[PDB]
Write a protein that binds this DNA or RNA. Structure first.
Ligand SMILES: [Zn+2]
Ligand SMILES: [Zn+2]
Ligand SMILES: [Zn+2]
Ligand SMILES: [Zn+2]
Lengths: 234, 234, 234, 234
DNA sequence: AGGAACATGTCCCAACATGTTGAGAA
DNA sequence: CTCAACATGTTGGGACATGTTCCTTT
């Protein structure tokens, strides 16, 4: 009640920042990212690949930490955790405590923390350099609850904070993205981007006609992302 | 689960890449390759010839490893293995462990690895130069499970990664192709190449509103570029 | 797992049976009963009045027990309990254990049992005679979970069994009705009674062949005979 | 070893037979019996009990055997067990061996064991006299595998031998019915009755037009019910 | 407080998917 | 060694299910 985890973006000296795959919005997609809202839509307990980018390799012993907080200010001080139901269910993973919302997949060096003061949960992993011929590293997350789970997130939007820190635990970089765990990411995603379009519509716009639905959605995706970089330029 | 090995193409210092041009005559193969999908269609336990291309002769001790991973991101962290039924089968030649999906044929120097940290399976063979009169080295594989095997791949599409490495295991080159092990390769290939065609024969147009003159310029050219390349499907 | 308690109607020596005729005025109830389904629609934790009818006054020590079981046979063996979230709620009045779904209201003699052999839950109260001027005894229930509560009933229809017994617990009578705890009782009732109607109004003509002259007569004396008795919408 | 037991409808002095609740060819189900085929279509691990009926209720202690045997004149020797895949799947129920096809939940009297010589699988339960306020008995059946699982029944038909046997285990009854555990008991059921009735249909056949998809099923829940009561040619 | 208008998890079933079997082609 | 017909588990997404928000109403 006297300290909330900072969510201010910060590239730092290593140009740290995140990247995500490109997905559709079909009623079959299990995970899909919206550059228009910097928000990930994923089904319960399904893999969420997050790409980590760097301009220069960080010092030895650098770790990456994932932590979730509530987006709305009236809930910001409330620790995000699993609901009574899903909490009362153990998984093959004997590493992550049954109360943690975020898990890391395929990494036995992962470590789950319960802050003794803030009581906030978080999972940390060693920073690994990109594979030879690659420009980024990628971590695979999982969210063990539906944003709607009663007794848990209870329909409250959450934000995921990814920090890059050194052996001492000092901040080296930080980025973030919103998350919504739901039954149909495709549907929910289309709905939100649809409500966003019918809003910031004002001014002089050039018109480009595109052939094909897939090609169009890519062009539209790259377009809405650019309109975001401007949304907060001043 | 287990971390995901890189699947990014990397020709490296030797311009490493794969080829799939092996006639039907001589060792009448029942498999077939589709360049339109970069996917091979083969039957369970049947020879699959793959061509290795390199610009200059690699150093002494170079090897060639083969590893299979699940294509879809929600399965990428799961290790690709054989199904219980086929695993306990006696189709084992001794050299290859009963749990490996990928096998090398006609090479007694092949070594099968069951990683102790990533739990991933793979098979390695010493790199061999092309035959006198050829500019490529052939290698023969065998897939011990149907892509549909329950308990196994379970109808989940897989991707085979071929990496070139030095005696130590350092990456020198990498390439890959999709694989589907079925009972009727010819059929399944027609169907999939057919579904691919229908996907690029839909003439529906969409309009996009672009803000900023320069931006429009960039997007337009991007489109004209894809446009002046649409007329070639004949 | 747990054996399934009998749900067969048995009026017994006292002609025991239930009734659901309680006006809206006085204790304005938000629940509603559908005789066309013998199913009660009520909201979470809201009073549900039920009438007890008997031909002759029962012996001293007679009690009335209430037990809920899942309707569908594939769930019948699962004990009906509250969900984790609502179970840890503070809506507990003390008398009733936090895990019980069914509660008795306005009766401090009510006893809650958590069977040590069947693990089934139930609540009992001493049988009380009708009020001067009435031929039925009223009892008030409270359902502490929504039929949709995950971790709990999980959208699975339940059935409430009311049994009349002697001081020892021997069966003297039994009756029952279905129950659905939802947020909008009125709506859900209309929908279900509506789906019931459409089920008994289909107007598509199909064909049926027979291989006899006698037996045919029976299915002949009923066919063009049921299409007559329809003095409801004509 | 021995051989395959009888399956000739032999009620005996005590008489014996069973029954199944209402089951329509509607694909809106998870199980259904086709009297015109004597085949119990049911999904995987979905409880599907059968009614116990007996005129002269045998002496307490008597038991009802239930076994599975292939109806094909070549596999009748092979024991009916679970596929290698599902075998790994160790269900919570430790009462039934993780290799037995049949199960019976919510019944401590459940008996499971491997034959000492032939090494067969069987389940036996004590004939519980119709309890207070009833007239018959009901046991909860299951099938932990599909009739198509490879490494198991492998697309091979089976019969559930239900013979009432005294405490000792001496013959007393003999009833039976074929089973086809699948994923679509509805479709599958009709896809058989079709080709079934497709044969032998030349002669005097009256007509009858029934209006009402449900009524049609009602005139079928009796007419066809007499195709086993009137059709006594053999 | 009764009730459209959301918000959001499940279900239905016609495709679709895919190993079998078998008769015919070169 | 190719197709046609089957035999059979899985899927895609519109329809349905179901708690929540908030204006209009006694
Ligand atoms: Zn939850
Ligand atoms: Zn297999
Ligand atoms: Zn609840
Ligand atoms: Zn099986």
């Amino acid at each position: 009640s006297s300290s909330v985890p900072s969510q201010k973006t910060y590239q730092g000296s290593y140009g740290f920042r995140l990247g995500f795959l490109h997905s559709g919005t079909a009623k079959s997609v299990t995970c899909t990212y919206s550059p228009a809202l910097n928000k990930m839509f994923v089904q319960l307990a399904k893999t969420v690949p997050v790409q980590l980018y760097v301009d220069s390799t960080p010092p030895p012993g650098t770790r990456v930490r994932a932590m979730a907080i509530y987006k709305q200010s009236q809930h910001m001080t409330e620790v995000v955790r699993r609901c009574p139901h899903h909490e009362r269910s153990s998984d093959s993973d004997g590493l992550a405590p049954p109360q943690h919302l975020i898990r890391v997949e395929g990494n036995l060096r992962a470590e789950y923390l319960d802050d003794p003061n803030t009581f906030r949960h978080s999972v940390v992993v060693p920073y690994e350099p990109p594979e030879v011929g690659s420009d980024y590293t990628t971590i695979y997350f999982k969210f063990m609850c539906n944003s709607s789970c009663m007794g848990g997130m209870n329909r409250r939007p959450i934000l995921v904070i990814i920090t890059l820190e050194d052996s001492s635990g000092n901040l080296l970089g930080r980025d973030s993205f919103e998350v919504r765990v739901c039954a149909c990411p495709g549907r929910d995603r289309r709905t939100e981007e649809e409500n966003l379009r019918k809003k910031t519509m004002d001014g002089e716009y050039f018109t480009l006609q595109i052939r094909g639905r897939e090609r169009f959605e890519q062009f539209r995706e790259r377009n809405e992302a650019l309109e975001l970089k401007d949304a907060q330029a001043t």
